Structure 1
Amino acid sequence: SEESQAFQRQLTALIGYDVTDVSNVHDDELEFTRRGLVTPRMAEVASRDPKLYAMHPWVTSKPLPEYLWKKIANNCIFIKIHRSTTSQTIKVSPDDTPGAILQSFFTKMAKKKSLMDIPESQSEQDFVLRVCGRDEYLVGETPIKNFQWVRHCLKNGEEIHVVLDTPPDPALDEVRKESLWDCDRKFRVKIRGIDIPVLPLTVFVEANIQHGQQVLCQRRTSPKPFTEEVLWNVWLEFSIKIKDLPKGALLNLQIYCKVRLLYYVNLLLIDHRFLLRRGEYVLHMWQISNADKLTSATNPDKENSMSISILLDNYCHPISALDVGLTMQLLDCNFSDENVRAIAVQKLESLEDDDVLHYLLQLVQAVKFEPYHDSALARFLLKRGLRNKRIGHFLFWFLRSEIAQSRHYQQRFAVILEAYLRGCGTAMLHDFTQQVQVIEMLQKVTLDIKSLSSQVISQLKQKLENLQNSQLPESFRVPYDPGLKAGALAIEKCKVMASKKKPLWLEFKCADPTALSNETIGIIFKHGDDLRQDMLILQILRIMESIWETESLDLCLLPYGCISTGDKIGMIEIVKDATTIAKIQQSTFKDEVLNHWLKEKSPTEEKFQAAVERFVYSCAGYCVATFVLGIGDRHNDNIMITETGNLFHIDFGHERVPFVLTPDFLFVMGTSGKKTSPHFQKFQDICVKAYLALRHHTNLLIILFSMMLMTDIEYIRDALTVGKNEEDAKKYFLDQIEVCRDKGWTVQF
């Protein structure tokens, strides 16, 4: 159908890759998978609730932290309900249902519906409690105490403002309609010969029968002058028998030139339908600059790539939270046994949307380690994404990102991404499409302005206007934050931060009227650096605050927003009322500076003593965390602090010193030189407490870290004092503090 094709265009637009392509395919696994995923889709679509799906409540079954239960005074929690230019503070019990809270407020308005400005006729059942300024609803049979946003407010100590407005139309989430000659014969392959357009010793071929990173058999060929089309036409029979080939077995062919590896390509010996591969093959190889070294995909670049030629015999054919995360250990390169992997994914199904959100990235990457495209692991992601709009959001960008910069897996992630899009509803597709236009729009401007490297300062404003005038959406959903709708663009505040790369500082007027403020949305659109890094450091950082939460610890980390939107492109959230330590020292010189700035920003004296307490915790949170991740040694320029005293590192891309605990920091804790302080003591106590809390999960952390590097990790094992007991590790950290306590401004200047 034409329409069916008009919609395909639309999808190929978000995906960024064409799945109907056949140019770089030596079979049909991709096509077969595209149809294999249809069932899981409809199945998930058919069972989801139109109401709750469209509202996508953010809740949690975890109990409430002690540091949070303490927060709520008596058995109540104040909530402010807004409508128009009116708002009221209502008392509510932690165990009160959003709907219950709404029945209350409504009865309290038995004769005042006019004040709030609630249409007398307008039923009460036709109202929903939405967080003001963002697309976060408080709905469903769930205690107000279990909504992430509440916990967020209680925690950060902010007030809870909900705007009484109308529920989304579920109708907006409409979804479109639509055996061998002998299994005892030792396997063997015929290497015809290599070939290559241009060229920079001698070279031979290496053929291995593999099952993951595990090499079974291995054969080579007679060395020959690395001409332009070396030939061999030799048979390489392996010791393995057809029947002995393991499911997912690979034919690894590598070109060696002490010999050096230059090229490599892989071929699935046992196709998805459990059938030995057979025939003539011309595989465009990959070139040396790991999971990429395992991909079964061939090189998209047919024009200028080393092509090896093989021939396989043919035959006759008629016509329980941080615990579950440990399961992710079975989903890396170490385990390739489909069965083993399945059990693992199964075990992951018991996770809640909130937890999947925390491992979504690790999991996505884990897909590269799968022998075939269709797998439980992909189906788990597909389903968990079609089931929840917030997961779906991040699953989109994570996939669209990999597709935008990894040709080794662009094909696979694409088939998966399309599977999702075909069932996330029409509304979702639209929102996705608007976002794509923007990140694809500002992307242009970034290159149009970075190629101009002040009058450029005006070039930015100019170009922004071009977009500003009928071309850029009236408003879009901030990528790193699905709950934030950035509307108008405040070109005035837009600039071009000067650094190695040329990041773009953009401000956007919130598109939400209920927004309890005139502040603007700050997003840094940066090109050049691969935001894949940051995302991983942040992803872990969050898994740490939860590790500490299960121990009543709030180190006050600030995992700002960051999402990779393409290749070496992406955006990073901007934290208002926050500057870098460097800038502060640049606005003066004395070890008291930082402490001064704080008090200078804190209104009341009681406010200052707060930032100090918060500084203490945040600083301990990052010290410990940055040390266990091996990124403590940093520059004042890469460290920021909020006017409320919440320290936090940024820009992740990694004399000697454990971490950053300069004089100015120590000063704020009321210490200097070699002395102590009640606050500095508190700092040490927290450090040690947090540090040990992380060691209680040393395993989870190593499995999470290694998984990354796969797409020496023996350092973190030391940072985590593995082997040593509490009383020993405790001393280990304290000592590290003393190191910073003596380096002063050595490493900083």
Structure 2
Amino acid sequence: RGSQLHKYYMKRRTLLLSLLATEIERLITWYNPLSAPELELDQAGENSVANWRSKYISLSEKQWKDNVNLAWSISPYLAVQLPARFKNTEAIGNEVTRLVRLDPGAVSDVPEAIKFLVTWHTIDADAPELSHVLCWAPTDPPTGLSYFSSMYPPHPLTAQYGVKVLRSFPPDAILFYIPQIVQALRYDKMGYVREYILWAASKSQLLAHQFIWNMKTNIYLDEEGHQKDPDIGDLLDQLVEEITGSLSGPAKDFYQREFDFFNKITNVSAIIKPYPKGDERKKACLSALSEVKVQPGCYLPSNPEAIVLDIDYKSGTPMQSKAPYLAKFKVKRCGVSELEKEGLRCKISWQAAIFKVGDDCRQDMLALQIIDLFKNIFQLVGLDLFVFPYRVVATAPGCGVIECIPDCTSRDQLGRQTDFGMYDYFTRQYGDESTLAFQQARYNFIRSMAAYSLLLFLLQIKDRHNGNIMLDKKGHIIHIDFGFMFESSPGGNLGWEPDIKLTDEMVMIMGGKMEATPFKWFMEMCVRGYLAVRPYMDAVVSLVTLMLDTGLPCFRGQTIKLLKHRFSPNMTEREAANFIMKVIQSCFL
């Protein structure tokens, strides 16, 4: 019977041809971002591929669901990895969900297959059967925390799995993901999260300090603090009273010493305010700083991976403003586990710390988390982008500790000193454009500028004037003061400010003409970065969704819908490249 084998081979030939065409299109799209008419390949093959794509793109709802059955008959893994090769049709997802529901035991790869079974219904909250999720491997923490948010109704099995996945990671990751954990208590009609917090605090040591420092601020709502929230405030009070006192011995002594030292170093700002501006305030601040002594075993909150050594008793310098001052420290960097074990028994540089009173320090924390995640993605993919994630920790209502970048050089001060373009500044500093150092400085400038422009476009950050950009010694540019984001916009939402700030001087740095080679380098780097950052939408959405209930002024309700749209999750690579190229040039002059 030759017909059976004939069709048996023809179907697989067609499927393989389609997959190869898709892969070739993706690779040739990745080759060169721009059209680049100078570069070219074989013409007949490209024409045949385009014709085949046009032929197979017109399939109806039928003769495509049947393909899923054939793929499943071949191998379950290939069927699971089918929607990753994007097809603009929702029937594939429904068929895959039905097949995986019919037999869940055939797949045990967690990073993608778990989401095809967990959501039996998004919000309907019915049909509690055949759900045995007590065998899947651990997944990323952002996916696990999604079951305690508003996206899914509560269920004992999902909560149990979410608790299980969180208990298989080193303490440093949990320390990184501290802020989102506490907010899960609001929608925690269950209490597995409370037991997990108690167990984690009993197990580790620095985690308890981070928990108390974070939770002490969140009990109130206003900056100064006079109104406790009616939802979880009493629960927070009960938790904070329960966790303390349980510890005893050397751990209790270390905690007491750390808190006493921090209170002694913190009261200076409150003490110094009544004195007005002048030398009297500076000398009083210096005397107050000299009053405190160095206690071995202490550590800075913003950098829990270092041990302080001594205090410089002449670095006190209050700033304009509320009495915020500045101080310098000499610190030793050891690590985390060694620091933890050395804190119960008793490579050196200098650091600068900035203290604030009466201001919120949470939006900056969220932005820093997003920036660090983007930096990790860029470092993993293998590109060359530079971003500096300065740390920041909040410890009291309206009060926090902010790190300072080494060799601070504000752009506003340089502009006041010079009152000229930055091109003149860097011509005087380094020399003529024909020297070797100028090329490296320009390359670093491009590296920083591309990534920062992409981030600024992606996160919709407003209020970016000359007084916030920071310039280092090498040539990189660093943004700061991210208070306004998403929807908040000073001036009354006028909107005439472009998405990407591009003045004439910065264009002239890269030659001043759009046809210059450095401009092409910048464009291709931006396109490649945007293409690379796309497939991590779910983690960002999960991270940003869980912090809506805090009632920050930035959020206004429609953040998620607009944020998800800007990623363009229903377009091919070439279309996305065209879109990003169009949007980039629209902000140029």
Q: 1:534 and 2:364 equivalent?
A: yes
2:453 matches 1:616: no
Structure 1 distance, partners of 2:507, 2:516, is 10
2:538 paired with 1:699: yes
Partner-residue secondary structure (3-state), 2:146 = helix
Equivalent of residue 573 in structure 2, options 715, 726, 734: 726
Map 1:356-435 onto structure 2 (within 5 A). Answer: 356-371=174-189, 375-389=191-205, 391-403=207-219, 407-408=228-229, 409-417=232-240, 426-435=249-258
Counterpart-to-counterpart distance in 2, 1:378 and 1:595: 55
Distance 1:574 1:720 in 2: 33
Distance 1:682 1:333 in 2: 43
| Structure 1 CA distance for aligned equivalents of residues 428 and 295 of structure 2 | 39
Q: Secondary structure at the match of 1:525?
A: strand
The structure whose residues are more often helix, as a share, is 2
Amino acid at match of 1:448: I
Matched, 1:599 2:422: no
Match of 1:580 among 410, 424, 428: 410
Local SS of the residue matching 1:488: strand
Contact 2:309/2:332 (<8 A) preserved: yes
Give the counterpart letter for 1:504 in structure 2: Y
Using the alignment, how far apart are the partners of 1:649 and 1:329 within structure 2? 31
Aligned residue runs from structure 1 range 188-207, under 5 A: none
TM-score, normalising length: structure 2: 0.62
Q: Is contact 2:147–2:154 with CA below 8 Å preserved after alignment?
A: no
C-alpha distance 609-396 of structure 1, shift in aligned 2 (>3 A): farther
Q: Tell me how far apart the structure 2 counterparts of residues 434 and 611 of structure 1 sit (CA, whole Å).
A: 46
Asked if residue 494 in structure 1 is aligned to residue 316 in structure 2, the reply is: yes
Q: Is residue 336–residue 369 contact of structure 1 (8 Å, CA) maintained in 2?
A: no
Matches within 5 A, 1:30-69: none
Sort the Cα spacing of 1:403 and 1:661 in 2 relative to 1 into closer, same or farther, 3 A: same
Of residues 497, 502, 509, the one that matches 1:656 is 497
- Quote the residue 2:154 is aligned against: 337
What amino acid maps onto 1:440 in structure 2? N
One-letter amino acid of the counterpart of residue 657, structure 1? P
DSSP 3-state at the match of 2:185 = helix
Residue 280 of structure 1: aligned partner: none
Residue 649 of structure 1, CA deviation: 1.6
CA pair 453-550 structure 1, distance change in 2 beyond 3 A: same
Q: Residue type of the partner of 1:697?
A: Y
Consecutive unaligned residues in structure 2, runs of 5 or more = 1-122, 126-136, 222-226, 336-346, 485-495, 551-557
**TM-score for the superposition, normalised by structure 1:** 0.50
Q: How does 1:671-682 map to 2 (within 5 A)?
A: 671-672=511-512, 674-682=513-521
Task: Mark the CA change 1:693 to 1:597 in structure 2 (over 3 Å): closer, same or farther.
Answer: farther
Residue 482 of structure 1: how far off its partner (Å): 0.8
Q: What does residue range 231-630 of structure 1 map to in structure 2 within 5 Å?
A: 323-339=140-156, 340-371=158-189, 375-389=191-205, 391-403=207-219, 407-408=228-229, 409-417=232-240, 426-452=249-275, 454-455=277-278, 457-470=279-292, 473=295, 476-499=298-321, 502-510=323-331, 516-517=347-348, 519-588=349-418, 589-593=420-424, 595-596=426-427, 599=430, 609-630=439-460
640-649 vs 590-599, greater mean Cα deviation:
590-599
Q: Which residue number corresponds to residue 8 of structure 1?
A: none
Looking at structure 2, the residues matched to 461 and 606 of structure 1 have their Cα atoms a distance apart, in angstroms, of 47
1:710 match: 549
Are the structure 2 counterparts of residues 591 and 579 from structure 1 closer, same or farther at C-alpha, using a change threshold of 3 Å? closer
Q: Which amino acid aligns with 2:500?
A: F
Contact 2:299 2:307 in 1 (8 A): yes
Distance (whole Å) between structure 1 residues aligned to residue 540 and residue 451 of structure 2: 16
Distance 1:324 1:573 in 2: 27
Residue of structure 2 equivalent to 1:688: 527
Query: Where in structure 2 are the equivalents of 1:9-48 lying within 5 Å?
Result: none
In structure 1, the partner of 2:59 is none
Asked if structure 2 preserves the Cα contact closer than 8 Å seen for 1:342 and 1:377, the reply is no
Measured in 1, the distance between the counterparts of 2:256 and 2:457 equals: 40
Corresponding letter in the other structure for 1:441? K
Give the structure 1 partner of residue 41 of structure 2.
none
Q: Is the 8 A contact 1:584 1:593 kept in 2?
A: no
Does the 8 A contact of 1:545 with 1:554 survive in 2?
no
Structure 2 distance, partners of 1:683, 1:430, is 55
Secondary structure of 2:526's partner?
helix
Change beyond 3 A, Cα 1:357–1:608: farther
Partner of 1:637, secondary structure, is coil
Total equivalences in the alignment: 416
Q: Which runs of 5+ in 1 are unaligned?
A: 1-213, 217-319, 743-749
Which is richer in strand?
1
Q: Any idea what SS the aligned residue of 1:538 has?
A: helix
Residues 147 and 159 in structure 2, CA contact (< 8 A), matched pair in contact too: yes
Answer whether contact 1:450 1:502 (CA < 8 A) is retained. yes
- Matched position secondary structure for 1:341: helix
- Which deviates more from structure 2 when the two are superposed, residues 696-705 or residues 551-560? 551-560
